[PDB]
Write a protein that binds this DNA or RNA. Structure first.
Lengths: 96, 92, 102, 79, 74, 69, 90, 103, 95, 77, 79, 97, 102, 92
DNA sequence: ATCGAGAATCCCGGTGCCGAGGCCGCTCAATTGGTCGTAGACAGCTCTAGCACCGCTTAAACGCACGTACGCGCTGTCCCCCGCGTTTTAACCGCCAAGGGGATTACTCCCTAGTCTCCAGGCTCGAGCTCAATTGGTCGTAGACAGCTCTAGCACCGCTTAAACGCACGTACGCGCTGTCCCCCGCGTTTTAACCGCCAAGGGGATTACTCCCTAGTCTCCAGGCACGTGTCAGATATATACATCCGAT
DNA sequence: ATCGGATGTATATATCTGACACGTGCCTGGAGACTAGGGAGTAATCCCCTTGGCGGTTAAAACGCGGGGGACAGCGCGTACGTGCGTTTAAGCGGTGCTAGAGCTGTCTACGACCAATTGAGCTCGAGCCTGGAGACTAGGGAGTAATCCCCTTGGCGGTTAAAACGCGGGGGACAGCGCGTACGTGCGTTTAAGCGGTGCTAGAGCTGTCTACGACCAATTGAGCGGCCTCGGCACCGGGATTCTCGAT
């Protein structure tokens, strides 16, 4: 058996739009946060909830960005998102 | 170690609208964030209003105008109704 | 208590204190914390009403962040008011662009 | 070191799925990483600034909340 | 300024009436509104143009404006 | 009165915005957009005017509305 | 040997009825009054000379004050001088 | 009746007039000139004494000393400007440490 | 017990900016004044208040110069004043 | 006699001037500067003294010298 | 209107060159304009004051010379 | 082609302009500046020609001296580039600020 | 004339008149305008001497403001006397800080 | 329209010190500015001197002391020499 | 476009349970509250600029047809890039010890906000005196008119040097890093400058007899400030060597 | 570093123009005598007082000695900023020519500083009280510092499901071709907008003043949430239903 390209993708969309769990792995994200913070001030510590706050903010940001990116892809009569879609979305947002 | 929050008041309101409904700790945290956020917005706008008009006092008038500036449409009308009713009842 | 005098559940005295110590103005009228408390209480009530509704639609008796997000984003004016706000553990509204469907 | 690579291809795919994306170019993933890193940098910078102003060595949830608020990305739930 | 003074003023007074009766306007208030409106429209047309070009067109269309306004959060 | 914001004016605005070619349907669309933006700003401006207990909208009323938006 | 001490003291009693002043501080106030006198009188003298006038009038004093004093001090001083001359004249 | 009394002043109109006449400033002196000048001098004296009195009261002293005059003058932008090249004996300086020197 | 380098310096700054007393010793200053004066005019005497006037003026001058000098040191990202700081300050003053 | 203006005195003057740290070479430099200043003022003061045909330098002589050097002093009139 | 902008970047560069300056930060030019304007304002204010005292409507070279003199910037050549 | 290294032409310009005495600001724009500023004190003023020229000589002499002191401040900080903080230090020590 | 009696080129009579009408003192001694005229003449002579020198160094026969500026600024005492004075069209002394050179 | 200046005297001095040298109009204007400036400084200081000493007369003594106050070093000595010589020659 | 198997995923019903949700209470700790009264602060008070509204003008700008080519939409292909099957691993992560940092525990040290004792420092009627009110005719300075010229301003029209605007880079400064040296800090000693105290007189501040020297008013003369015609050194302009200095090369 | 070469600056240059300083002469106002007078300034002539002098005490300020950390100063490495470059345009400058306030000078008259006594009270000093403040002083707070404690980390040890990776093959992107259609320049009728005038007039703006608003302050109090106890219900899990895409066919 084999599902056609797109069927499982759509299924995944429904699945992940139904739920609320964080989609990035906890520990690797934590390492990311600590590395970046350490390049501003050495020997910093973190409250647990601070890292969790950062992850919620980051994932919400990326999900919204992917919504706008998707709209840009569809605008160009594509179904595939590409870097130029991201760049357009962010240019119009005033991030770039 | 004494930390104040709006939790018990949020809960009382919750029991008013949905008598048999509870709320998770995380959700309550979001509600507390909400109340503090709106507090800041309204108080700040009122402060600006009083300043613009060379008044040293923030009155219910500044609060109301701030509410009208910050809130959308019917939400603004309903909020103004609640505040006005509360102030007139308090005065009596 | 002033809250009882105003017919409110939210704390008028506390709101008054926070207004006094938030450096918003040199003076604060007697009606201002009452009005503010009433508004905060009302908005709390609207969000909790809608969130409770969502919770029951989902056959849940306890409100979780998901229900708050559903309540807010499915309501045009609340969505407007909290347009630049992130609800932790809220997720998003189910929505698939029509062109993507088979 | 190199922890941005911990933001994996399948993780980015999941984020995109929640964002309603059905199909994804191969170049998206690296692009996403760059974008994410910039975002994170900006938030954490401000957060650490608050931490430093308070003469603390521990970044608090409130430090992050303030950073986000002043960057126009108000976050509820961590006060 | 690229919009004519008198029709803009007329529009401003019309719109204002539906919020508050008996209003008057400072001259500089109407000029302020016009500077702000024109600046907004020019910026919106910049973004709209970017959307048109994104779709490999050189002609701006309503859907370009609508995409720009959706992404702006309008 | 919205029709007083003419086609050539909208064209001039678009040219400053760098637009080379323009669909016929743009103009009406632009008008709707303009109206919304004006209503929003003016709604706030007048609110300020009313708080000051004035009948004259000032430049500052407008500036404050714009700032808060 | 002249000084402004008694007049300084009268003014002091006007603005702060229960406040006194040390000898050194009074010496500094006297130095001050003489200094400003010299500045204003000198500028007025030059004003009169430049314009080939042999008389220093209140107008020269006023212009000299406008030249020598900054901002609000100049405006208030001009106001007091004008008021005093008006009260005096009648 | 004195001229100062007629002018509503405490500072000496007659003396100021004589000092103008004998200071080799001009061949002649108008009647209003010493009134105006005396009024200006009195005003400035009043402003300085007002602030200095305040500083004296903060220091819980009933007498104004040179220190209070220096504090009053240097903490007032326009007085400080007017007396920019003047040294007040026993006045000291304003407390002021550059931020970079602090821990 | 030993305060760290800088703590006592700062304490002294606060102390001496708080007060108004003359900071140079009376007798050596007087001796210097008479010595310098002798190379201009013979047989001179001095009023007491004349020497005190010279000292108030001198100390006010030095304190102000040290303020400017300090600004020059800080400009060069130092916290230590050096002769070149004084020389820059005096050159810009027109001295 | 210039060496009578001691290191701790110069340090006190610098502290009032807001200085936190001081190079060892400052003191001699300061002395030279002081001497020049004194010389100039005193040269003028004595000139006034001589014009008045006096042998005693007065406070006023000093005040006039200071004034004419753009360093007006209050308190000694 | 806005005539301070007539004090151009190359003019300010030339003035700096005569002042012995070899290299110039981009922010200098605006800074210079502000400084110049203040200076000019102060001189012209006094000059006009003299003009007004003389009951004239024409600012003379002497008005300017007097203003400059009383501001401790004596100018030779225009008496 | 040929290109002088950064600084060579600058030094050449220093020698050139320190050799000469001509005013370095354009006449007519300076005149407009003077008239605008004067008009904000009293309307309808006229100017003697030599009055405007006097003002220009004074202004340019002032700026050149200020640039000398500014340059000294830059060099003090072991820089060769003058910056706003150099100007501000020079003017603070001059007693202008 | 008094100038001839004093052996001077500068005008003693005129200087006397200017002293009388400058309101400097009620009375003026007979020697005062002579002394003043002599001093003014001398200082004029020193500046003109040095300026002439500069003019010839520049192979010019006519003194211009540049020569006056060179003369004054290259002389320590004249530079001191005219320390707060602007010479119109004088320019500045050639001087480049050593650290700026290649 | 009669305007007095020091031009001819400056020129006579110029011919004394540099017989074959001329001077531009601008330069002469600077010289006139110079003479007037120094006149003012010396006369003003002398006025102050006479005042300080309760004298109603400015004499050559006041001029001389003013010269010593205003002029630097050797310039002062030379100027004093010229003035003194001139006054003694005048007296005879 | 339309069932049908079926195996797959997902859903749906039931189970047991375990930690979150609910509930009090302890007390302390987060609320009001009566009276104060000065107070901003809001309500009555005028004048106005400027504001509303009008009463023309034509002309920049506004609308209406023409072709028309630029711009976009619609299909077929290519591929190749990504989506969905199996297979392997490695960091995730549960998850269970250990240690340095930091905060906050107390945990110690010199500075700090007030507490009284004893003045030297200002307040007070009495006794002078000299510097300031009171006029009268005075020039006489100047204020107000008034004509007349000058020149500051406007303003049109060239053109051309200069001012603006990218761009390739190439230093040049801003930050990191380290050795160090060299100046803060205190402490043990010593001067030696206060502190107090006494005397001599040198000089200075005031006093007067007088005097000469500097003002006042006059006469005339001329030196000299203003025009005016003139060589001449200053500037312009091609023209000319001699540096002056940046890519190759020791 | 040094030497060339190679252009590119700078610099005397000799020639011609030129305008501008200058020497001539020309009236007038300001200087120089010039006398007479009166008052600014001397030169004794004093009291006396302020300032050098000293002289002994001593107590703290200064000095020297030694010790450390931390500021200075290389030193380097980066990036990005300002520069040197050419190109384009735009506005300054010169020209030319009209102007219309306004300087400017002179005119006539009149306020009005002044000198001159003249009275006189404000000032000023004295001798004899009467206090804030200076110092000597305390009671508490400052922070500087560890100190142990707890937390956050680090690690370690699994096991493991997802991740990495691949295999493969199918389907969108996009492109080109062509249809194809609509703004748009364009040209001309139009029409009302902005300018230009204008008058009467409404609320905004500045203003005056009493009052009611609210910090405010322990005096009084009552509920709330950290802690803890207790309880179920949804969540993980196990097994049947549904449905359900995808091959099996048109």
């Amino acid at each position: 058996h084999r599902y056609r390209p797109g069927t499982v993708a759509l299924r995944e969309i429904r699945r992940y739009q139904k739920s609320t769990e964080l989609l990035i792995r906890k520990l690797p994200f934590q390492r990311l946060v600590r590395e970046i913070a350490q390049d501003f001030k050495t020997d910093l510590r973190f409250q647990s909830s601070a890292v969790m706050a950062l992850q919620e903010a980051c994932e919400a940001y990326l999900v919204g960005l992917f919504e706008d990116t998707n709209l840009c892809a569809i605008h160009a009569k594509r179904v595939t998102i590409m870097p130029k879609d991201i760049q357009l979305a962010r240019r119009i947002r005033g991030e770039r | 170690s004494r930390k104040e929050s709006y939790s018990i008041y949020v809960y009382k309101v919750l029991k008013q609208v949905h008598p048999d409904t509870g709320i998770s700790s995380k959700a309550m945290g979001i509600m507390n964030s909400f109340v503090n956020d709106i507090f800041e917005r309204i108080a700040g706008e009122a402060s600006r209003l009083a300043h613009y008009n060379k008044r040293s006092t923030i009155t219910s008038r500044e609060i109301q105008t701030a509410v009208r500036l910050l809130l959308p449409g019917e939400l603004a009308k309903h909020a103004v109704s609640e505040g006005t009713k509360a102030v007139t009842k308090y005065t009596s | 208590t002033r809250s009882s005098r105003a017919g409110l559940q939210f704390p008028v005295g506390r709101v008054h204190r926070l207004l006094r110590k938030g450096n918003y103005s040199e003076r604060v009228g007697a009606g201002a914390p009452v009005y503010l408390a009433a508004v905060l209480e009302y908005l709390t009530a609207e969000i909790l009403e809608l969130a409770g509704n969502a919770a029951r639609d989902n056959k849940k008796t306890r409100i979780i962040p998901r229900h708050l997000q559903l309540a807010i984003r499915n309501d045009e004016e609340l969505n407007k008011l909290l347009g630049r706000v992130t609800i932790a553990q809220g997720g998003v509204l189910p929505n698939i662009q029509a062109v993507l469907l088979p | 070191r190199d922890n941005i690579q911990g933001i994996t291809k399948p993780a980015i795919r999941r984020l995109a799925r929640r964002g309603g994306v059905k199909r994804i170019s191969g170049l998206i993933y690296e692009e996403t990483r760059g974008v994410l890193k910039v975002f994170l940098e900006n938030v954490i910078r401000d957060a650490v600034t608050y931490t430093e102003h308070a003469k603390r060595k521990t970044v608090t949830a409130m430090d992050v909340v303030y950073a986000l608020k002043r960057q126009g990305r108000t976050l509820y739930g961590f006060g | 300024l690229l919009i004519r003074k008198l029709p803009f003023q007329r529009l401003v007074r019309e719109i204002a009436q539906d919020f508050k009766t008996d209003l008057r306007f400072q001259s500089s208030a109407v000029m302020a509104l016009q500077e702000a409106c024109e600046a907004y429209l020019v910026g919106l047309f910049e973004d709209t143009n970017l959307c048109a070009i994104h779709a490999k067109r050189v002609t701006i269309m309503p859907k370009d404006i609508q995409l720009a306004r959706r992404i702006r959060g309008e």
